[PDB]
Amino acid sequence: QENHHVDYVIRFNYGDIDTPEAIKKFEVLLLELSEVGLQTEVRQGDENSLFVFVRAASKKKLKRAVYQSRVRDWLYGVRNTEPEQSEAERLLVIYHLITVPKAEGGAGITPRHGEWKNVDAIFPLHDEETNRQCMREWSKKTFLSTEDLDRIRNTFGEHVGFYFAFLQSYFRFLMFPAAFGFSCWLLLGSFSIIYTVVNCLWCIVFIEYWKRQEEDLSCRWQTKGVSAVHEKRAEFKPEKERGVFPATKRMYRQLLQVPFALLAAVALGAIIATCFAIEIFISEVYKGYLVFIPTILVSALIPTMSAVLLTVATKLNDYENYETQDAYKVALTQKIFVVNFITSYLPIILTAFVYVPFASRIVPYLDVINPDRLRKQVIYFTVTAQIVGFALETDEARFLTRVRNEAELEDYDVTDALRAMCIQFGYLALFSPVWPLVPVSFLINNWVELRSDFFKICVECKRPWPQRADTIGPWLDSLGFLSWVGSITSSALVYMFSNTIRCWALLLTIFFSEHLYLIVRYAVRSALAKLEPPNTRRERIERFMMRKRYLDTVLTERFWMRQRGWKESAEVGLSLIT
């Protein structure tokens, strides 16, 4: 093939070790790779690092690897076939040959955690025929079929497959608010009740539909349940019998998220109040569109402030010392959600429920505010970042240098572009009745950046190892929390700013709209549970027939003496009736 049958390539760096110490850690790595059935070949890489090439050493060793991985998947509950395939399947079982805890599988490699500090990251090689002769059919397509998502599952794994399927379903479901809000901008305007009810209905229906499509796609890609949690770079304090860490010592570090979030909220509310003060000063001392210059500056500085808070949250999450990857991911997603909620929505919350209604009590406290100010805030905080972001755009030595060019690329992260599609959903759920062209501005940006994720995953960063998944992650609970908060927030905004405040009716239409949201969400979930998707119905039919075939295969004392057999019992019965 194009790649020289290479499954993986393992980069071992020696720029931080001695001359005689690196020759022992290299021999230990080669002996651990040769203890399992992996054939190794060493070549020179960069000026301080050499990489080895890992292949299946034989057909018998590869068959034993696939059988051991299928045994682990059947024992953990992923497989239900009691075992006795593709490119992603072979790459997954070879990555499980390299990187497991050595009690099963083998080779014990953890890339830069402990006792393997010299080796750098390991990675497979890019399928050139799949990211050249198929990447330029996916960018100029605008919509992907299920057989097209099968090609992004068979390469790059089910993790990338679920991420791209979620982006496709979100772009397909975004076409309804992008048409409806534009239809409710030429006809109804800002703060309309019809658009708010239909927008909250859409926010319910999209989440309850993707929750069904996830169970559809995890039964289609034969990955219906993944609870096989993996280890990490945990620093265990004791070693009592397995490394242990007390949860009471973890909660005392988990409580540090509260002062961090509170200080970030105060430090951003100070910037928002400063922007209000400079806007009032410019409105006093002169001016049409130039009076909202610091709001535009802080709305453009949002994505570089959230990154700083993201690095602080990553350091705080690494301090909390999690054991499993499926807990570190959940805690990181919770911290990213808190940071993005503080960063992206609280500038609009502080001008929707604090600044504009209590204008006469804070404007004299700032000088040393009609609802169009809130409309301009929702305009400036969902558009200008995307405007600025789209303004910065304006014999075998060939294979070895291709691999050396592939080792200098970045590493892909789903959790960076999936964070933005949560901020968009939070702007859609919470403050979208303020300006109904928020879905149009999101759909245009998504249609522009649709051909930017294929390019990124194909030519900009290296190929990820094929990771299995049954869901997009804990972002699907963040979407539900955003819809729940938006059902209160949009109803309060529509009451406060359509057409005194009558404070009993505001807290009545908060209560009734929240509980109507809960009732309608239960109804939509129970209605979508009834209708079964096809590729999880085929799996249920197959698992029913596989059980029915097996079941059809497998198929004092003188009182019980007066009626031998059953014909005598029938004779006693016929004598006893008459």
Which CB, 293 or 507, lies closer to a copy of itself?
507
Q: Across-strand partners of 42?
A: 52
Per CB under 8 A, 26 contacts a copy of itself: yes
Q: How far is the CB of 348 from ligand PGW (least distance, A)?
A: 13
Picked from a copy of itself, ligand PGW, none, the partner binding residue 23 (CB below 5 to 8 A depending on kind) is: a copy of itself
Other beta carbons within 10 Å of 93: 24
Per CB under 6 A, 135 contacts ligand PGW: no
Per CB under 8 A, 573 contacts a copy of itself: yes
Picked from ligand PGW, a copy of itself, none, the partner binding residue 481 (CB below 5 to 8 A depending on kind) is: ligand PGW
Which CB, 99 or 295, lies closer to a copy of itself?
99
Helix (H, G, I), strand (E, B) or coil at 401: helix
Q: Across-strand partners of 40?
A: 54
Dist. CA 338–CA 346, nearest whole Å: 11
- Tokens linked to 400: 């070895």
Which CB, 22 or 440, lies closer to a copy of itself?
22
Per CB under 8 A, 570 contacts a copy of itself: yes
Task: Mention every residue, 6+ apart, whose C-beta is less than 8 A from residue 477.
Answer: none
Q: Which pairs from 311-314 meet CB under 8 Å and 24+ separation?
A: 312/260, 313/260, 313/338, 313/339
Per CB under 8 A, 121 contacts a copy of itself: no
Stretch that binds a copy of itself, among 15-23, 183-191, 203-211, 456-464 (CB under 8 A): 15-23
Question: Which DSSP string do the residues of 466-493 spell out, in sequence order?
Answer: ----SSS-THHHHHHHHHHHHHHHHHHH
Q: How far is the CB of 253 from ligand PGW (least distance, A)?
A: 13
Residue among 574, 360, 332 at smallest CA distance from 474:
332
Other beta carbons within 10 Å of 383: 19
119-124, strands of its sheet edge to edge: 38-46, 49-56, 8-13, 119-124
Binding test (CB under 8 A) with a copy of itself, winner from 9, 10, 52, 272 = 52
Binding test (CB under 6 A) with ligand PGW, winner from 38, 66, 125, 494 = 494
Interaction residues for ligand PGW, span 200-239 (CB under 6 A): 200
Per CB under 6 A, 342 contacts ligand PGW: yes
Per CB under 8 A, 499 contacts a copy of itself: no
Gap between the terminal Cα atoms of the chain: 89
Stretch that binds ligand PGW, among 365-373, 446-454, 456-464, 481-489 (CB under 6 A): 481-489
Tokens 């219906």 appear where? 224
- Report how many residues bind a copy of itself under the rule CB under 8 A: 62
Q: How far is the CB of 151 from a copy of itself (least distance, A)?
A: 24
Per CB under 8 A, 508 contacts a copy of itself: yes
Residue among 184, 206, 196 at smallest CA distance from 421:
206
Other beta carbons within 10 Å of 421: 19
Interaction residues for ligand PGW, span 243-272 (CB under 6 A): 257-258, 261
Dist. CA 453–CA 414, nearest whole Å: 10
Q: How far is the CB of 374 from ligand PGW (least distance, A)?
A: 13
Per CB under 8 A, 555 contacts a copy of itself: yes
Q: Which pairs from 401-404 meet CB under 8 Å and 24+ separation?
A: 403/9, 403/45, 403/51, 403/125, 404/45, 404/46
Binding test (CB under 8 A) with a copy of itself, winner from 104, 129, 235, 460 = 104
Torsion angle, alpha carbons of 318, 298, 490, 442, to 10: -80
Dist. CA 10–CA 42, nearest whole Å: 10
Handedness of CA 203, 205, 211, 214 (dihedral sign): negative
Per CB under 6 A, 478 contacts ligand PGW: yes
Q: What does each C-alpha distance from 167 to 2, 171, 426 come to in angstroms?
A: 31, 6, 16
Which CB, 250 or 375, lies closer to a copy of itself?
250
Task: Mention every residue, 6+ apart, whose C-beta is less than 8 A from residue 61.
Answer: 36, 37, 38
Task: Mention every residue, 6+ apart, whose C-beta is less than 8 A from residue 326.
Answer: 229, 230
Per CB under 6 A, 476 contacts ligand PGW: no
Q: How far is the CB of 523 from ligand PGW (least distance, A)?
A: 8
Stretch that binds a copy of itself, among 70-78, 188-196, 208-216, 273-281 (CB under 8 A): 70-78
Per CB under 8 A, 102 contacts a copy of itself: no
Dist. CA 188–CA 186, nearest whole Å: 6
Which CB, 504 or 550, lies closer to ligand PGW?
504
Binding test (CB under 8 A) with a copy of itself, winner from 265, 273, 280, 510 = 510
Per CB under 8 A, 271 contacts a copy of itself: no
Interaction residues for ligand PGW, span 504-533 (CB under 6 A): 505, 508-509, 512-513, 515-520, 522
> Contact positions toward ligand PGW, by CB under 6 A?
193, 196-197, 200, 257-258, 261, 334, 337-338, 341-342, 477-478, 481, 484-485, 487-488, 491, 494-496, 498-499, 501-502, 505, 508-509, 512-513, 515-520, 522
User: Which residues of this chain interact with a copy of itself, rule CB under 8 A?
Assistant: 1, 4-5, 14, 19, 22-23, 26-27, 30-31, 33-34, 39-42, 44, 50, 52, 55, 64, 67-68, 71-72, 75-76, 104-105, 247, 396, 399, 503-504, 507-508, 510-511, 530, 547, 550-552, 554-557, 559-560, 562-563, 565-566, 569-570, 572-574, 576-578
